[PDB]
Design a binder for this molecule. Sequence first.
Ligand SMILES: NC(=O)c1ccc[n+]([C@@H]2O[C@H](COP(=O)([O-])OP(=O)(O)OC[C@H]3O[C@@H](n4cnc5c(N)ncnc54)[C@H](O)[C@@H]3O)[C@@H](O)[C@H]2O)c1
Ligand SMILES: NC(=O)c1ccc[n+]([C@@H]2O[C@H](COP(=O)([O-])OP(=O)(O)OC[C@H]3O[C@@H](n4cnc5c(N)ncnc54)[C@H](O)[C@@H]3O)[C@@H](O)[C@H]2O)c1
Ligand SMILES: NC(=O)c1ccc[n+]([C@@H]2O[C@H](COP(=O)([O-])OP(=O)(O)OC[C@H]3O[C@@H](n4cnc5c(N)ncnc54)[C@H](O)[C@@H]3O)[C@@H](O)[C@H]2O)c1
Ligand SMILES: NC(=O)c1ccc[n+]([C@@H]2O[C@H](COP(=O)([O-])OP(=O)(O)OC[C@H]3O[C@@H](n4cnc5c(N)ncnc54)[C@H](O)[C@@H]3O)[C@@H](O)[C@H]2O)c1
Ligand SMILES: NC(=O)c1nn(-c2ccccc2)c(=O)cc1Oc1ccc(Cl)cc1
Ligand SMILES: NC(=O)c1nn(-c2ccccc2)c(=O)cc1Oc1ccc(Cl)cc1
Ligand SMILES: NC(=O)c1nn(-c2ccccc2)c(=O)cc1Oc1ccc(Cl)cc1
Ligand SMILES: NC(=O)c1nn(-c2ccccc2)c(=O)cc1Oc1ccc(Cl)cc1
Lengths: 266, 266, 266, 266
Amino acid sequence: TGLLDGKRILVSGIITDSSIAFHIARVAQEEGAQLVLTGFDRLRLIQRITDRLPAKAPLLELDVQNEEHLASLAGRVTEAIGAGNKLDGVVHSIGFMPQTGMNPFFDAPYADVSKGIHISAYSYASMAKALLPIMNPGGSIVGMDFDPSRAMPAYNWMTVAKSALESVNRFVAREAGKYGVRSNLVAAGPIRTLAMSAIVGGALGEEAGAQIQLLEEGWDQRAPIGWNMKDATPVAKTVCALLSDWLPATTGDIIYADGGAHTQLL
Amino acid sequence: TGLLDGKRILVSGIITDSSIAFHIARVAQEEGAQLVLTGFDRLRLIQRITDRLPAKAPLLELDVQNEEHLASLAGRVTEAIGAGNKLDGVVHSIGFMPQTGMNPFFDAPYADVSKGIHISAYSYASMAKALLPIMNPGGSIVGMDFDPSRAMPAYNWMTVAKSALESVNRFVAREAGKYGVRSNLVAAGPIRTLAMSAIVGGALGEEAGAQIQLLEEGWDQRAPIGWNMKDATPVAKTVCALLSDWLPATTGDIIYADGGAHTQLL
Amino acid sequence: TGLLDGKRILVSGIITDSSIAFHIARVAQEEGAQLVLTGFDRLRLIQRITDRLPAKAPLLELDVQNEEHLASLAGRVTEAIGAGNKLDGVVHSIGFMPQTGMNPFFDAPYADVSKGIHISAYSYASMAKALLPIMNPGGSIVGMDFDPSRAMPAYNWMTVAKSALESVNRFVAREAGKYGVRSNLVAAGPIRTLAMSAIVGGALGEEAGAQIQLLEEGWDQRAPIGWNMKDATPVAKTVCALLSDWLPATTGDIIYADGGAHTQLL
Amino acid sequence: TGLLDGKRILVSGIITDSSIAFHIARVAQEEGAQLVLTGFDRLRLIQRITDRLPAKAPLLELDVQNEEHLASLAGRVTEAIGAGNKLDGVVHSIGFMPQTGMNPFFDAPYADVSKGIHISAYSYASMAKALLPIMNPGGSIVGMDFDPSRAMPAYNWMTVAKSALESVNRFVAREAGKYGVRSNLVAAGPIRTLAMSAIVGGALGEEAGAQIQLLEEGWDQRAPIGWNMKDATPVAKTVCALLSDWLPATTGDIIYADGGAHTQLL
Ligand SMILES: NC(=O)c1ccc[n+]([C@@H]2O[C@H](COP(=O)([O-])OP(=O)(O)OC[C@H]3O[C@@H](n4cnc5c(N)ncnc54)[C@H](O)[C@@H]3O)[C@@H](O)[C@H]2O)c1
Ligand SMILES: NC(=O)c1ccc[n+]([C@@H]2O[C@H](COP(=O)([O-])OP(=O)(O)OC[C@H]3O[C@@H](n4cnc5c(N)ncnc54)[C@H](O)[C@@H]3O)[C@@H](O)[C@H]2O)c1
Ligand SMILES: NC(=O)c1ccc[n+]([C@@H]2O[C@H](COP(=O)([O-])OP(=O)(O)OC[C@H]3O[C@@H](n4cnc5c(N)ncnc54)[C@H](O)[C@@H]3O)[C@@H](O)[C@H]2O)c1
Ligand SMILES: NC(=O)c1ccc[n+]([C@@H]2O[C@H](COP(=O)([O-])OP(=O)(O)OC[C@H]3O[C@@H](n4cnc5c(N)ncnc54)[C@H](O)[C@@H]3O)[C@@H](O)[C@H]2O)c1
Ligand SMILES: NC(=O)c1nn(-c2ccccc2)c(=O)cc1Oc1ccc(Cl)cc1
Ligand SMILES: NC(=O)c1nn(-c2ccccc2)c(=O)cc1Oc1ccc(Cl)cc1
Ligand SMILES: NC(=O)c1nn(-c2ccccc2)c(=O)cc1Oc1ccc(Cl)cc1
Ligand SMILES: NC(=O)c1nn(-c2ccccc2)c(=O)cc1Oc1ccc(Cl)cc1
């Protein structure tokens, strides 16, 4: 008798125990969801990580850049959930931007930007095209986003990728609505993941690290209810809220799991 | 084992069985909530209406224009829920704008506009000031709104009142956060209430009625998942979603229960 | 051969040489505009101030709370510009919020808030209703605004008044368009006026003063082209740009003269 | 004694006499600007078109996909305007999206989308990187945009490209501010160009054509001051307003030359 009791939900984006998707999968499992998981490249690494989730879930290989993976996805999912069964939810927690994109903004070559927008924005439509035929009416497609309304230091082309992702969602909703399915994004505040901690520790340089740290601190002071960058649970709960039947008139939208920071100047 | 199981929630704004608040109260009761209700002026009428809710709830008199009602509210609530007990949720479903405000836009006198903004926008802060001292950490204040981003025909000063209400919410969140309480609004699409049907039937004139009907129709065509103006249940579910613990990092915000219409041009 | 050469423009809101309107009037006069000015209560004070403008302009008494002043305004203006002549532009640089409104947010009584919204938001429509019948096609109504999208400390009910003003503008544009007239707002960054400097110097308290100073500093760091709070000339130029024929397809809108700060997170 | 008297402005995007850039160049020339023009591929066609501008202007070859063109651009411009002279303005009126991108939204392959985002969004930063070193303090970079806030039929991936372009602008402003240069976009309503008329006449199909026509009609009814899709002059004037010194505190922003349509629901 959980929030997602009996729902069949696909969750992508697990790579480490710090991934937002890991906590999405954990909360959803605690809430009665039967999950199908997607992973990219490091499959043996992902299997080991996912063994720590409350329940066992079938792991599938999915590179969003691979057209053959996408074409075979619906088949590979139906084979995992059972014939005659469909998905009730889909979670997109996929994002990437080469080193040059997140180095000055003018120094990122288009090849790097294009790979970033492919994986971070275009993939949301790729996943929808492939999974909507095997989704039930009342279904929910959730994507992971960060507020790209105003420009910020260090994130550069990843912010551009988010602006595109938000636009992609708005169109996915048009297609998803034909199937009785909702399409929405969760705009989260900064969450200290492996990539987030490394960059803050000066992996992408000192100027990048200092800027990210000021962003994080500014977030907790702006957020009326506070913001804990070490806690992905408030984000994971919000995604489950969208996967549930408790937001039935919300599509093409963005739900801000940011502590209320986007609503405050200072 | 419901969404709001064991939560003590105050619900204002019930006047008829078509009121958005009636359905908010119904869904919340179905979800395990113990409710305290507020009514205005026509108390014998409201008692009769509320007798149709799944469970009995104490009815309290509250005119948001009455400073004595607001000052005595916390006391009257604690007396109803029991000493030592606090509220876990508050619902604002209060709105009014004299006939002249919703007649040309330039013809509404300030006395009429001021009464409208008092009841429709200022009251949200009045309620918060009075009920936050008797609210528990993790609490939720929800208000009823409609998207006032772009101007529209016939709604005129009620749209202005909504623009103010959205701004009020953003500040209420600053105060509510001190108490561990969230403050948010639900921006709903058109819902055929008694006031809504009367105005559409030419109560406020022909030009007003025709404009409202075009608004309603335009809403269903824009909304990717459709929009049923005769169904307040998708709205009522969204308010309960905010009263729950499933949106814990959302404050000073607006959740659109509009079928996705605000995200689409046409 | 200036930007507003031969244009007849009404300018309200001059009280001191630090008023945004004083600089609006100065730039417009430098640009070939023949001006009609409105003042409130301290008429002998305003006459003395306005004597410092590049050219002499007729001063008119206008309290926006006075219904008789508004009703007699068109007549008093036509008598000043000459019979058969009309206004080509109108400038609204009027704003007020009692001490309690800008003291905690919950402590402001409605009487104080209502006076604030009357003078700061409703007056924009009052002025439009009165001056549109004496405005020429191609005309321009400009109002002074500050970004109320996100809540901020100390400004409280003045921010709410701005949110309402922006909504009012959107409706004024509907009425103004019938006359071939544009209606827009200029959202300026902080400008060190007499009221602004006093409040920063601890007139409205220490917490208020400290918050305003942090707002000002944060503005210059966010603004890509910088922000000089001691210089109202960039604001005054933007208002003239809207009074000109160089923004002919912009109405119901907001032009941000803020140094680009609203477009940047940090 | 014009708006841009003595200003040296680069204008890209001229292909036909119906191109928004042709009218931008015409108005700017009428306003005292000395222009440098860029063209793509069909150089003999562009030279013939540009011969109809009020004054002769040097034409330069610039494919935004060509890294050698961008690297040699500053040199080729300085050689055209004269050594020691710099640009005071830059106009980006470049946009493209393959046939599949504007066919269902899910059917556009990434190769087509990537080419579109390259030419329509990334190119804005490419141009800025190359031309900022040869731009004077007080300079202005203007880009052509359409409101991508809400999704619409038929435009699909071109809308996504615009959402990215708006984000790109916000970052370009950060870099441009270092040089004392402003960076802004002009969001125009539909303008009947050769590509616009062809698509409306059923070049991209019937469903696409019908949708574009409904968009155009809906624009004129929403716009308080009206909207003439056959007139690019109001757009061209707005770009010149941004190239002027009359909007000195506006950067990373969007100016809507849409007749006020984005501010109105219906
Ligand atoms: N970290 C934050 O603070 C933050 C905030 C808001 C939103 N987000 C978003 O949340 C999502 C997940 O990020 P995270 O913070 O959990 O980090 P993460 O590194 O744990 O997740 C990114 C995931 O993308 C996957 N991925 C990359 N390239 C792929 C490809 N070609 N095919 C398929 N999958 C691919 C990786 O395998 C990984 O699982 C991203 O969309 C990110 O932008 C992050
Ligand atoms: N009807 C719609 O389509 C729609 C859409 C979105 C939001 N809303 C909002 O939902 C809320 C409820 O409206 P509804 O549509 O259910 O209509 P309704 O008439 O049933 O509710 C309005 C309520 O306001 C109360 N009220 C008025 N003056 C009051 C006062 N002085 N003190 C206390 N209460 C007072 C009335 O008693 C009534 O219960 C309003 O805030 C409204 O603006 C309505
Ligand atoms: N100061 C800033 O930083 C800032 C920034 C953006 C926008 N604004 C806005 O600019 C406008 C002008 O403010 P300012 O900063 O120049 O300060 P100001 O004190 O010089 O101007 C306010 C004006 O409002 C007039 N006014 C007040 N009550 C009135 C009434 N009843 N009838 C008629 N006029 C009345 C006053 O006489 C005065 O001229 C206001 O709308 C304000 O909110 C100010
Ligand atoms: N047409 C409208 O209604 C409308 C409305 C708002 C904004 N816009 C924008 O205005 C701009 C100009 O479009 P238009 O309507 O004048 O049409 P247009 O076809 O006349 O202009 C597009 C231009 O892009 C150029 N271009 C394409 N690929 C290029 C490349 N690889 N390198 C360099 N230049 C390249 C073309 O040569 C052409 O001059 C575009 O950015 C467009 O999206 C158009
Ligand atoms: N905390 C981070 O370092 C971070 N990381 N990413 C990210 C980028 C690529 C891949 C995975 C996550 C994001 O997408 C966002 C990140 O933090 C932000 C940045 C900006 C904002 Cl508004 C909110 C959160
Ligand atoms: N359907 C209606 O007639 C209606 N009614 N009210 C309203 C006004 C005063 C009191 C109660 C409800 C609203 O506040 C809003 C109403 O409909 C709208 C109007 C505009 C929009 Cl964007 C969405 C819904
Ligand atoms: N600098 C100030 O102190 C100030 N003052 N007023 C104000 C209020 C009432 C009457 C005149 C001006 C405003 O309306 C705005 C003011 O500064 C702000 C405040 C917030 C923002 Cl976003 C931008 C500028
Ligand atoms: N009228 C059109 O057909 C049109 N064409 N383009 C376009 C696309 C690619 C190249 C040049 C112009 C656009 O970028 C925009 C166009 O019209 C729109 C479409 C949407 C909106 Cl919100 C406003 C105008």
